[PDB]
RNA sequence: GCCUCGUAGAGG
RNA sequence: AGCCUCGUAGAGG
């Protein structure tokens, strides 16, 4: 209803998009402004978004796979209007357009799909270790002071958390105070390590217009802290991954991280 | 001048913790020879070697060989050592259980590519970089440790760890040491100009070392310096250079952090 | 993830 | 397009 949930779209077209990352974030503006563009500007401008829209990795030529994820309530149902009312003449990316052939909105339709409500998510088994698996490259903006652009593109567990924290806090409603936020961020770069990983790999992938760096695989995060608050925070965070992604550039499908 | 130097032993059984007992005969030889060595380096924080069993395209071990290599940074370290083994060696170099036969000792780049020798000068000069690539060859971990009494290990290719460590060795032993501005301006530069690149065949390892189990990684690792500065660009060319001789990270004289610069 | 140094990186 | 906006460590197009 107005639950987090993922989808995934196989729009089956003549040739593939030229930039799919890129194409599809404007598929979604525009069909999101078809219905309501107050919305859709208000939206653009929020420098938190609460979706991902991500092409999956690893099909055929001349087909694609979209998922979608959303945290918000309102921003679900415009889309769907707008791709029901979409679909009949096919979607397009960039110049051509493609065949809805198929929505996956069913977690056994595609394990990378479903919902849950932000109470499951909250009461989510509290945890000491917490595994991901990175499916398309991720990265963390590790700005620093003069027109420093740098980029951090590896499981930094610090960081990890640290996206999931401040996605948990724009995007929810139950919220810590200010002082739990705190007393989170001191326990996670005091308590958090490196526990292991899997099958990393560096890549440089556009994510829209631009390059970024970005890393794939898995990764398993240890927290010393037994105190319980922490724990079930960690809990919260590795479900939450599932719709929120990690780190930067989710809105142009890097980030797509998975719970494990 | 710091040395690299592979030496291959001989033996029934391959060592039970060879990193440890490597690290027991390296003294045992070290202090028969200059007692006064052994104590000395014992009590340093920070000991101008390596030890590490080396692990590809040299194909299958025979049962019951093994390979140091012993890198020194100082002048002084290498000359005894040799000494001290030579002399042990027909009784039988023991590490363990079981003593084990000097077969070879290749000191020379062209006997083993991880052997060699360099000049402290030559370092110092050698050519500014703008990326420097690494391939650890055995785990390579770092120590983050936190307040109030916690321990951390962060077993990845941070840059900013990375060439910190570099750093702080190049500053222990190099006779050609950084001011303590030139020095603080680099770590400044570090913190602020220092990307990954890139990296290869990353993967984690749990290991054994010293007294404890450590994790670590290894692969290839580019980095790249943003900064324009040719303070830094040189100090990249020093400390890329030492990596084959200081080695990258903690427990180096245990057998972990074997970088080499590619 | 034991001991030691003290804050964050290290030594056995 | 290591470019633009935000200005301190992380983000948005």
Redesign the pocket.
């Known amino acids: 209803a107005s639950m987090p949930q993922a989808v995934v779209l196989e729009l089956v077209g003549e040739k593939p998009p030229l930039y799919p990352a890129r194409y599809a974030?404007g598929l979604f503006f525009a069909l999101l402004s078809r219905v309501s563009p107050e919305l859709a500007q208000k939206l653009?401008?929020?420098?938190?978004?609460p979706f991902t829209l991500a092409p999956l990795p690893r099909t055929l030529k001349g087909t694609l796979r979209l998922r979608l994820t959303t945290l918000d309530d309102g921003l679900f149902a415009p889309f769907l209007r707008a791709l029901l009312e979409a679909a009949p003449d096919g979607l397009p990316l960039g110049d051509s357009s493609y065949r809805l052939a198929r929505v996956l909105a069913t977690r056994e339709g595609h394990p990378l799909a479903g919902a849950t409500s932000w109470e499951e998510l909250k009461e989510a088994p509290k945890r000491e270790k917490a595994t991901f698996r990175f499916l398309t490259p991720t990265?963390?903006?590790?700005?620093?002071?003069?027109?420093?652009?740098?980029?951090?593109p590896l499981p930094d567990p610090?960081?990890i958390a640290?996206?999931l924290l401040?996605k948990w806090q724009a995007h929810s409603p139950f919220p810590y105070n200010p002082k739990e936020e705190a007393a989170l961020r001191e326990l996670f770069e005091l308590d958090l390590?490196v526990?292991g990983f899997r099958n990393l790999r560096f890549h440089?992938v556009q994510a829209?217009?631009?390059?970024?760096?970005g890393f794939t695989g898995e990764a398993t995060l240890?927290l010393?802290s037994q105190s319980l608050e922490a724990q079930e925070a960690l809990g919260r965070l590795h479900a939450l991954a599932f719709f929120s992604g990690?780190?930067?550039?989710?809105?142009?499908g890097m980030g797509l991280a998975v719970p494990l």
């Open positions: 974030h653009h401008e929020a420098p938190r978004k990265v963390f903006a590790t700005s620093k002071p003069g027109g420093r652009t740098r980029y951090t610090r960081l640290g996206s401040d390590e526990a440089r829209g217009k631009g390059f970024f760096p240890r010393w990690v780190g930067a550039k989710t809105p142009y």
